[PDB]
């Protein structure tokens, strides 16, 4: 894992002490085999975007996450009704 080969890491951690969801939540398992070097594996888990997203929930604050549609934008699905032609004082109509 720390070396980057998270494939064997997950394969060994599927049915081992602590467990994957436990590691997702709890890192206090005194079993030394249920822990890994965090940054080495993490930055070394580069080819695992989807795996990283699925394994551990993102501990974001209560602020809203990315909203990839704008009021003018989603409105533009009605062709001339793209609210960019006016309402420049409103950012949501981006």
């Amino acid at each position: 894992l720390l070396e980057g080969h998270t494939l064997l890491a997950l394969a060994t951690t599927m049915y081992s002490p602590g467990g994957v969801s436990q590691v997702v939540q709890n890192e206090e398992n005194e079993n030394c085999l249920k822990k890994v070097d965090p940054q080495l594996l993490k930055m070394a888990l580069t080819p695992y975007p989807k795996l990283k997203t699925a394994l551990f929930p993102q501990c974001t604050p209560p602020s809203v996450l990315p909203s990839d549609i704008t009021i003018y934008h989603l409105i533009q699905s009605l062709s001339p009704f793209d609210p960019s032609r006016l309402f420049g004082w409103q950012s949501a109509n981006t």
Binding site: V64, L65, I71, L74, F81, L86, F87, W89, Q90, A92
Partner: protein, 68 residues
Amino acid sequence: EHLSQCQNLTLYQGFCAMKYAIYALCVNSHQSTYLARCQQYLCSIPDSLCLELLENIFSLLLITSADL
């Protein structure tokens, strides 16, 4: 999710009030239920979203072919 959709709800409400207002405005050019449809939807909308919509209505009142 639902809290996120709650923000989207006012937007959906804004989306809900979006279509009705223009439809009343649309026929009123080439020439009322649509107007109240927004207005009724506008009676029960959020703060900043509905203020923005009212500003848009004012613009619609102060628009021309170029502004079109």
